[PDB]
Amino acid sequence: VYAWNRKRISNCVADYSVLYNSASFSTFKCYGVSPTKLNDLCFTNVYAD
Amino acid sequence: GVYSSANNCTFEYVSQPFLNFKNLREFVFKNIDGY
Numbered sequence: 830v831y832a833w834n835r836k837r838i839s840n841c842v843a844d845y846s847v848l849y850n851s852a853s854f855s856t857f858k859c860y861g862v863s864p865t866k867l868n869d870l871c872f873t874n875v876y877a878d
Numbered sequence: 879g880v881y882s883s884a885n886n887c888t889f890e891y892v893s894q895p896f897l898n899f900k901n902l903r904e905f906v907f908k909n910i911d912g913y
């Protein structure tokens with residue numbers, strides 16, 4: 830956690846429904862956006878920490 | 879020998895090669911609306 834990895838995700842199609850429909854995640858809390866409309870919206874860059 | 883460092887990358891794209899004088903290559907480069 831002190832040296833958390835940051836991966837910049839760009840120039841691809843991000844399928845968020847695979848993550849949302851998984852039952853393997855204990856917490857899937859989204860702040861500032863809703864999971865339902867993630868699969869439609871488009872973003873400049875994604876930061877994965 | 880064209881560069882010495884690369885620090886912060888935002889975009890990478892790898893594609894198929896584009897290429898008496900025998901060949902004539904014409905290119906047009908435009909910057910419109912961030913495209």
Ligand SMILES: *[C@@H]1O[C@H](CO)[C@@H](O)[C@H](O)[C@H]1NC(C)=O
Pocket residue numbers: 885886
């Ligand atoms: C750009 O690179 C420098 C050093 O390589 C780094 O300190 C800085 O935070 C970077 N900025 C961005 C926006 O990546």
